[PDB]
Amino acid sequence: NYCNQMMKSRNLTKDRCKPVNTFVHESLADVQAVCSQKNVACKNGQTNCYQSYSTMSITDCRETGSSKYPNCAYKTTQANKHIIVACEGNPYVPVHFDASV
Amino acid sequence: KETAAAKAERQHMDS
């Protein structure tokens, strides 16, 4: 399971099971460019969010109903969609993953 | 220690 392997390798489920996480299959530079595209509001109402002009390759990792510490288990779902990142700093880069439409 | 941008890349980038 790609999700079970990647959540672990990346230190997300080494000490706990995280319910959901999204992985983006694009170059780092292309995702950082989003912070300069379509400005939109973030869920929390803040407006330092941006939506990608085009869809990107991503896979959603979602914990199943029968997942519990030590043995976290995920359902893997590949898709192409517009990402939304919240941005911050200088260089203005992504600090959070707010969504994917 | 880990910044917010480095953390974001580690948790979400799989170039």
Give the three-class secondary structure for A40.
Answer: strand
Q: Angle A6-A7-A8 (CA atoms, 0-180°, nearest 5)?
A: 85
Query: B residues 1-15 near A, CB within 8 Å?
Result: 4-5, 8-15
Q: Å resolution of this model?
A: 2.2
Give the three-class secondary structure for A71.
Answer: strand
How far is the C-alpha of A43 from the C-alpha of A59, rounded, in Å? 21
CATH superfamily ID and name for A1-101: Ribonuclease A-like domain (3.10.130.10)
Tokens 């990402």 -> residue? A83
Tell me if A21 is assigned to a ligand binding site.
yes
Q: Which of A12, A21, A89 sits opposite B5 (nearest CB)?
A: A89
Q: For residue A32, give the H/E element and its range.
A: helix A28-32
Candidates B12, B13, B14, B15; catalytic one: B12
Is A96 an annotated catalytic residue?
yes
